[PDB]
Amino acid sequence: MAVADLALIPDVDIDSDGVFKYVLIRVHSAPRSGAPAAESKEIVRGYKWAEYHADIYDKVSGDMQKQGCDCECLGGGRISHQSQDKKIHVYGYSMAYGPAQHAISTEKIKAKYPDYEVTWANDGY
């Protein structure tokens, strides 16, 4: 046995090399289905293999629930960093789950990669 804690869960983990979908997932203190805490946390996941936002939500919340944690996607979007300005960018929406709070994503991705900067604008697709 082991028991996670919301601080131990990776805050951002992604596999990025172009344009690919991501989801914002709220996570709650339910490790072992018996952790005494009742906090909440958010994670940023997104990978080129998740051609649809449901793919990451099913995989990731499956892993969270295997640790014990209970979850809800706040929404989906996509991460890109193409442009002519290397600022990573977060935008778009899921159709099953709507637009995420891309605000949370940028502050987390900036903190993960302080050598770079990140922006969002919900105007895109």
mmCIF file of N, CA and C in Angstrom, residues 13-78:
data_model
loop_
_atom_site.group_PDB
_atom_site.id
_atom_site.type_symbol
_atom_site.label_atom_id
_atom_site.label_comp_id
_atom_site.label_asym_id
_atom_site.label_seq_id
_atom_site.Cartn_x
_atom_site.Cartn_y
_atom_site.Cartn_z
ATOM 1 N N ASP A 13 2.032 17.916 -16.345
ATOM 2 C CA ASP A 13 2.779 16.880 -17.048
ATOM 3 C C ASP A 13 2.121 16.764 -18.413
ATOM 4 N N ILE A 14 2.910 16.937 -19.468
ATOM 5 C CA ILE A 14 2.467 17.038 -20.850
ATOM 6 C C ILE A 14 3.577 16.450 -21.730
ATOM 7 N N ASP A 15 3.243 16.049 -22.958
ATOM 8 C CA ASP A 15 4.213 15.661 -23.986
ATOM 9 C C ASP A 15 3.877 16.510 -25.202
ATOM 10 N N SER A 16 4.679 17.557 -25.407
ATOM 11 C CA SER A 16 4.406 18.631 -26.353
ATOM 12 C C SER A 16 5.462 18.682 -27.455
ATOM 13 N N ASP A 17 5.022 18.767 -28.717
ATOM 14 C CA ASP A 17 5.892 18.998 -29.876
ATOM 15 C C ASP A 17 5.083 19.553 -31.065
ATOM 16 N N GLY A 18 4.134 20.462 -30.806
ATOM 17 C CA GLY A 18 3.317 21.069 -31.854
ATOM 18 C C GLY A 18 1.987 21.564 -31.303
ATOM 19 N N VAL A 19 0.894 21.014 -31.833
ATOM 20 C CA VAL A 19 -0.493 21.348 -31.522
ATOM 21 C C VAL A 19 -1.162 20.042 -31.087
ATOM 22 N N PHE A 20 -1.729 20.006 -29.880
ATOM 23 C CA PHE A 20 -2.328 18.810 -29.287
ATOM 24 C C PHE A 20 -3.267 19.238 -28.156
ATOM 25 N N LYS A 21 -4.242 18.388 -27.834
ATOM 26 C CA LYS A 21 -5.307 18.714 -26.892
ATOM 27 C C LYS A 21 -4.836 18.520 -25.454
ATOM 28 N N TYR A 22 -5.483 19.224 -24.528
ATOM 29 C CA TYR A 22 -5.198 19.179 -23.104
ATOM 30 C C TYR A 22 -6.527 19.324 -22.344
ATOM 31 N N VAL A 23 -6.558 18.918 -21.076
ATOM 32 C CA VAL A 23 -7.690 19.111 -20.180
ATOM 33 C C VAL A 23 -7.186 19.654 -18.848
ATOM 34 N N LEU A 24 -8.069 20.394 -18.182
ATOM 35 C CA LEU A 24 -7.867 20.914 -16.843
ATOM 36 C C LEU A 24 -8.710 19.996 -15.971
ATOM 37 N N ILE A 25 -8.135 19.345 -14.962
ATOM 38 C CA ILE A 25 -8.877 18.406 -14.127
ATOM 39 C C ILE A 25 -8.712 18.831 -12.679
ATOM 40 N N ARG A 26 -9.841 19.106 -12.025
ATOM 41 C CA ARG A 26 -9.892 19.305 -10.591
ATOM 42 C C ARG A 26 -9.807 17.927 -9.957
ATOM 43 N N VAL A 27 -9.120 17.861 -8.833
ATOM 44 C CA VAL A 27 -8.731 16.692 -8.086
ATOM 45 C C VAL A 27 -9.078 17.030 -6.633
ATOM 46 N N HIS A 28 -9.558 16.055 -5.863
ATOM 47 C CA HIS A 28 -9.995 16.241 -4.482
ATOM 48 C C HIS A 28 -9.291 15.212 -3.601
ATOM 49 N N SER A 29 -9.087 15.542 -2.323
ATOM 50 C CA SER A 29 -8.525 14.640 -1.330
ATOM 51 C C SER A 29 -9.436 13.429 -1.091
ATOM 52 N N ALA A 30 -9.199 12.369 -1.859
ATOM 53 C CA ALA A 30 -9.761 11.044 -1.672
ATOM 54 C C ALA A 30 -8.720 9.907 -1.850
ATOM 55 N N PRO A 31 -7.372 10.093 -1.775
ATOM 56 C CA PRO A 31 -6.446 8.958 -1.788
ATOM 57 C C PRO A 31 -6.865 7.831 -0.836
ATOM 58 N N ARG A 32 -6.567 6.577 -1.206
ATOM 59 C CA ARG A 32 -7.005 5.365 -0.491
ATOM 60 C C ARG A 32 -8.521 5.296 -0.223
ATOM 61 N N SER A 33 -9.334 6.181 -0.811
ATOM 62 C CA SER A 33 -10.741 6.360 -0.467
ATOM 63 C C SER A 33 -10.915 6.573 1.052
ATOM 64 N N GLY A 34 -9.906 7.148 1.728
ATOM 65 C CA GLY A 34 -9.866 7.205 3.186
ATOM 66 C C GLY A 34 -8.865 8.206 3.765
ATOM 67 N N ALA A 35 -8.156 8.988 2.939
ATOM 68 C CA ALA A 35 -7.347 10.105 3.422
ATOM 69 C C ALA A 35 -8.233 11.070 4.238
ATOM 70 N N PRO A 36 -7.766 11.588 5.391
ATOM 71 C CA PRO A 36 -8.578 12.440 6.260
ATOM 72 C C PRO A 36 -8.728 13.872 5.725
ATOM 73 N N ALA A 37 -7.837 14.307 4.826
ATOM 74 C CA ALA A 37 -7.911 15.612 4.178
ATOM 75 C C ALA A 37 -9.180 15.722 3.319
ATOM 76 N N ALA A 38 -9.587 16.959 3.027
ATOM 77 C CA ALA A 38 -10.730 17.296 2.178
ATOM 78 C C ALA A 38 -10.395 18.544 1.347
ATOM 79 N N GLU A 39 -9.130 18.663 0.938
ATOM 80 C CA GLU A 39 -8.658 19.735 0.078
ATOM 81 C C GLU A 39 -9.030 19.422 -1.382
ATOM 82 N N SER A 40 -8.708 20.355 -2.277
ATOM 83 C CA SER A 40 -8.791 20.179 -3.718
ATOM 84 C C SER A 40 -7.574 20.849 -4.365
ATOM 85 N N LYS A 41 -7.253 20.423 -5.583
ATOM 86 C CA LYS A 41 -6.079 20.790 -6.368
ATOM 87 C C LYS A 41 -6.503 20.676 -7.832
ATOM 88 N N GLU A 42 -5.734 21.228 -8.761
ATOM 89 C CA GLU A 42 -6.009 21.118 -10.185
ATOM 90 C C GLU A 42 -4.733 20.632 -10.862
ATOM 91 N N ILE A 43 -4.881 19.863 -11.939
ATOM 92 C CA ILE A 43 -3.784 19.364 -12.755
ATOM 93 C C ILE A 43 -4.034 19.722 -14.218
ATOM 94 N N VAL A 44 -2.939 19.818 -14.967
ATOM 95 C CA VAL A 44 -2.912 20.119 -16.391
ATOM 96 C C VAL A 44 -2.296 18.886 -17.045
ATOM 97 N N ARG A 45 -3.043 18.225 -17.935
ATOM 98 C CA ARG A 45 -2.598 17.063 -18.709
ATOM 99 C C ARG A 45 -2.921 17.337 -20.167
ATOM 100 N N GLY A 46 -2.085 16.878 -21.091
ATOM 101 C CA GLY A 46 -2.320 17.026 -22.516
ATOM 102 C C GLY A 46 -1.192 16.371 -23.282
ATOM 103 N N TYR A 47 -1.542 15.598 -24.307
ATOM 104 C CA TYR A 47 -0.579 14.758 -25.008
ATOM 105 C C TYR A 47 -1.035 14.564 -26.445
ATOM 106 N N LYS A 48 -0.084 14.384 -27.365
ATOM 107 C CA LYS A 48 -0.382 14.156 -28.778
ATOM 108 C C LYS A 48 -1.214 12.885 -29.003
ATOM 109 N N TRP A 49 -1.118 11.875 -28.126
ATOM 110 C CA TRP A 49 -1.937 10.670 -28.250
ATOM 111 C C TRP A 49 -3.423 10.920 -27.952
ATOM 112 N N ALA A 50 -3.783 11.930 -27.147
ATOM 113 C CA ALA A 50 -5.178 12.253 -26.873
ATOM 114 C C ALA A 50 -5.743 13.102 -28.013
ATOM 115 N N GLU A 51 -6.156 12.438 -29.090
ATOM 116 C CA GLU A 51 -6.788 13.068 -30.248
ATOM 117 C C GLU A 51 -8.172 13.666 -29.896
ATOM 118 N N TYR A 52 -8.730 13.337 -28.726
ATOM 119 C CA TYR A 52 -10.009 13.817 -28.206
ATOM 120 C C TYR A 52 -9.856 14.029 -26.695
ATOM 121 N N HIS A 53 -10.622 14.949 -26.107
ATOM 122 C CA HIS A 53 -10.421 15.384 -24.727
ATOM 123 C C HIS A 53 -10.892 14.307 -23.761
ATOM 124 N N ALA A 54 -11.931 13.558 -24.139
ATOM 125 C CA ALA A 54 -12.374 12.400 -23.381
ATOM 126 C C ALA A 54 -11.245 11.386 -23.155
ATOM 127 N N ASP A 55 -10.250 11.303 -24.050
ATOM 128 C CA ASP A 55 -9.190 10.302 -23.931
ATOM 129 C C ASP A 55 -8.330 10.570 -22.699
ATOM 130 N N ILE A 56 -7.889 11.825 -22.534
ATOM 131 C CA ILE A 56 -7.104 12.232 -21.378
ATOM 132 C C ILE A 56 -7.970 12.179 -20.125
ATOM 133 N N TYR A 57 -9.225 12.641 -20.161
ATOM 134 C CA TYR A 57 -10.050 12.639 -18.958
ATOM 135 C C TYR A 57 -10.250 11.199 -18.456
ATOM 136 N N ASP A 58 -10.547 10.241 -19.342
ATOM 137 C CA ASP A 58 -10.718 8.838 -18.957
ATOM 138 C C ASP A 58 -9.429 8.240 -18.386
ATOM 139 N N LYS A 59 -8.296 8.429 -19.074
ATOM 140 C CA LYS A 59 -6.997 7.906 -18.648
ATOM 141 C C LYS A 59 -6.580 8.506 -17.309
ATOM 142 N N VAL A 60 -6.585 9.830 -17.211
ATOM 143 C CA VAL A 60 -6.017 10.536 -16.079
ATOM 144 C C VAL A 60 -6.899 10.317 -14.862
ATOM 145 N N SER A 61 -8.215 10.513 -14.956
ATOM 146 C CA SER A 61 -9.066 10.296 -13.797
ATOM 147 C C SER A 61 -9.129 8.816 -13.429
ATOM 148 N N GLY A 62 -8.866 7.902 -14.369
ATOM 149 C CA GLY A 62 -8.677 6.496 -14.060
ATOM 150 C C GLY A 62 -7.457 6.334 -13.155
ATOM 151 N N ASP A 63 -6.319 6.945 -13.504
ATOM 152 C CA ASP A 63 -5.120 6.920 -12.667
ATOM 153 C C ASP A 63 -5.357 7.589 -11.315
ATOM 154 N N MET A 64 -5.990 8.767 -11.296
ATOM 155 C CA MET A 64 -6.333 9.456 -10.057
ATOM 156 C C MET A 64 -7.173 8.554 -9.160
ATOM 157 N N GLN A 65 -8.217 7.915 -9.689
ATOM 158 C CA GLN A 65 -9.078 7.037 -8.917
ATOM 159 C C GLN A 65 -8.364 5.743 -8.512
ATOM 160 N N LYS A 66 -7.371 5.274 -9.277
ATOM 161 C CA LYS A 66 -6.508 4.175 -8.847
ATOM 162 C C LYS A 66 -5.652 4.609 -7.650
ATOM 163 N N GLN A 67 -5.179 5.865 -7.583
ATOM 164 C CA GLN A 67 -4.553 6.389 -6.361
ATOM 165 C C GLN A 67 -5.613 6.588 -5.253
ATOM 166 N N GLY A 68 -6.850 6.898 -5.646
ATOM 167 C CA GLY A 68 -8.042 7.032 -4.813
ATOM 168 C C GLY A 68 -8.770 8.354 -5.089
ATOM 169 N N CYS A 69 -8.027 9.369 -5.547
ATOM 170 C CA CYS A 69 -8.482 10.732 -5.784
ATOM 171 C C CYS A 69 -9.746 10.770 -6.641
ATOM 172 N N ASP A 70 -10.641 11.699 -6.314
ATOM 173 C CA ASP A 70 -11.873 11.947 -7.057
ATOM 174 C C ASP A 70 -11.646 13.189 -7.912
ATOM 175 N N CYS A 71 -12.255 13.253 -9.101
ATOM 176 C CA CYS A 71 -11.925 14.259 -10.105
ATOM 177 C C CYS A 71 -13.129 14.768 -10.895
ATOM 178 N N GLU A 72 -12.956 15.910 -11.568
ATOM 179 C CA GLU A 72 -13.884 16.452 -12.547
ATOM 180 C C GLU A 72 -13.044 17.258 -13.546
ATOM 181 N N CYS A 73 -13.174 17.043 -14.867
ATOM 182 C CA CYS A 73 -12.535 17.969 -15.801
ATOM 183 C C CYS A 73 -13.263 19.322 -15.654
ATOM 184 N N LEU A 74 -12.539 20.435 -15.510
ATOM 185 C CA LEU A 74 -13.154 21.761 -15.561
ATOM 186 C C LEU A 74 -13.507 22.125 -17.009
ATOM 187 N N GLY A 75 -12.856 21.483 -17.982
ATOM 188 C CA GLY A 75 -13.102 21.625 -19.405
ATOM 189 C C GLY A 75 -11.899 21.081 -20.165
ATOM 190 N N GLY A 76 -11.853 21.349 -21.467
ATOM 191 C CA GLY A 76 -10.715 21.036 -22.314
ATOM 192 C C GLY A 76 -10.355 22.226 -23.190
ATOM 193 N N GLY A 77 -9.237 22.098 -23.895
ATOM 194 C CA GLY A 77 -8.700 23.079 -24.822
ATOM 195 C C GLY A 77 -7.530 22.441 -25.560
ATOM 196 N N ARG A 78 -6.682 23.221 -26.217
ATOM 197 C CA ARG A 78 -5.464 22.698 -26.816
ATOM 198 C C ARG A 78 -4.315 23.630 -26.503
#
